[PDB]
Amino acid sequence: PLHSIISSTESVQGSTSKHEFQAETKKLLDIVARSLYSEKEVFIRELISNASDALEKLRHKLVSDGQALPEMEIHLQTNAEKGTITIQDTGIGMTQEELVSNLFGVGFYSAFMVADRVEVYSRSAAPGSLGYQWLSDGSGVFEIAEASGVRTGTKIIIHLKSDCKEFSSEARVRDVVTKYSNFVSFPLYLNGRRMNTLQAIWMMDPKDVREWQHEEFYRYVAQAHDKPRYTLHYKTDAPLNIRSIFYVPDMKPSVALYSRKVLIQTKATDILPKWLRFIRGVVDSEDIPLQESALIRKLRDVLQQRLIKFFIDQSKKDAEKYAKFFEDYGLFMREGIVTATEQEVKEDIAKLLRYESSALPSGQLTSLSEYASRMRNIYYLCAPNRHLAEHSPYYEAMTEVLFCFEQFDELTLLHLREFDKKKLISVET
Numbered sequence: 001p002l003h004s005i006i007s008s009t010e011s012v013q014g015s016t017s018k019h020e021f022q023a024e025t026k027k028l029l030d031i032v033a034r035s036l037y038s039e040k041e042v043f044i045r046e047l048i049s050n051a052s053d054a055l056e057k058l059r060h061k062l063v064s065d066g067q068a069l070p071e072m073e074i075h076l077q078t079n080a081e082k083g084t085i086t087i088q089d090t091g092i093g094m095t096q097e098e099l100v101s102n103l104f105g106v107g108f109y110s111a112f113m114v115a116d117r118v119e120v121y122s123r124s125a126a127p128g129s130l131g132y133q134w135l136s137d138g139s140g141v142f143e144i145a146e147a148s149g150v151r152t153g154t155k156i157i158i159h160l161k162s163d164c165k166e167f168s169s170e171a172r173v174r175d176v177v178t179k180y181s182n183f184v185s186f187p188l189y190l191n192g193r194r195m196n197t198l199q200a201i202w203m204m205d206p207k208d209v210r211e212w213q214h215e216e217f218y219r220y221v222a223q224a225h226d227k228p229r230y231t232l233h234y235k236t237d238a239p240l241n242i243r244s245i246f247y248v249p250d251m252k253p254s255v256a257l258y259s260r261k262v263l264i265q266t267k268a269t270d271i272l273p274k275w276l277r278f279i280r281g282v283v284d285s286e287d288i289p290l291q292e293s294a295l296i297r298k299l300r301d302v303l304q305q306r307l308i309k310f311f312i313d314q315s316k317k318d319a320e321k322y323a324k325f326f327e328d329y330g331l332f333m334r335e336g337i338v339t340a341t342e343q344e345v346k347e348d349i350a351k352l353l354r355y356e357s358s359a360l361p362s363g364q365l366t367s368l369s370e371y372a373s374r375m376r377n378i379y380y381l382c383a384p385n386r387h388l389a390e391h392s393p394y395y396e397a398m399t400e401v402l403f404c405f406e407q408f409d410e411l412t413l414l415h416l417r418e419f420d421k422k423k424l425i426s427v428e429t
């Protein structure tokens, strides 16, 4: 199973030319290495992502021009003795100008957070392209030389800081890799061993997903053995860039925050209203950078609205299955209603609520709007059982009414004092 492509074939025959970019870039650079990211291990993530993006560029072009595909792999090698960590990719390399002009690569710089000396070799995938070597110690001055024996792609060799040698250990690197890069879009190896094994299905055309795939991914993100009770595959580009999958568990009573097929936070509870905390799955957007009160709240609402409609349409696609779901999760809806501030938010959430009707036969649950059809005001009755609710003289004088058999349901109706073109009033007035 041993497989590695990283070895020291490159070399520079001549001398290098020294460069020092402008003071501002120097500041932005010291900023990236000191205060940009809150975690240091994430450098393994950023570089990996950059490699993946480069490989697609090659594949997309080799296909757009109809040529055979080479080995599109991503390799990471640790050296504890030399205290080094290397990452190489076959993805279409960088030109000489690029290696000088750039500064995308905003994430490549993250390495200086852990490295005191960075060493790079690149060879643009275009034929007849030359390989070049890029050196730097983080002081704002880099060297460029023409290198030989450079394979098409990019190779990065990091000489860790005296205190960051922990990464040079394989086990540590694999922990980080499996933490962030478990869904990378290209084969990834670490000292020879393939690490990733998961497909980020949340990027596929929803019409091209299979049920067993959703079950596997649900059991991963949720870490359960039951199957999904409900599944929502949401892609959006008009409000914001969203690619997510939401699962309602089969068993009765969090969501991951990915981006560019790489994970930022595993418990992105902010992305969904607190009353929807029972949802599992993933949400992936290109709009996110250990604190979150950001404007991404708009996302938190786009999802809140989208999920509501999803739960409404489901009620109209299967009433008994949704009835079981509501009997199992209505606690959250009533909570989110009692907690909502704008009455519009409450009424939106309340559209999921279902009750038994005086005109409907016992055992039938209806939404507020559905009852609204037969109508100038809504009227309910909080009684223990259907027999008691029908026998009720308060009801005996009748036109159509709804029945509550639990105290929290009555309190819920009393919280949202009104609904749409209606007013919620107790028959026991």
Ligand SMILES: Nc1nc(Cl)c2nc(O)n(Cc3ccc(Br)cc3F)c2n1
Pocket (backbone or CB within 6 Å): 047, 050, 051, 054, 089, 091, 092, 093, 094, 098, 099, 102, 103, 104, 105, 106, 108, 120, 134, 153, 154
């Ligand atoms: N990994 C990878 N692969 C490819 Cl093809 C890239 N093209 C880029 O512009 N960057 C970012 C970048 C800019 C300057 C320097 Br020095 C290094 C570096 F990585 C790439 N990174």
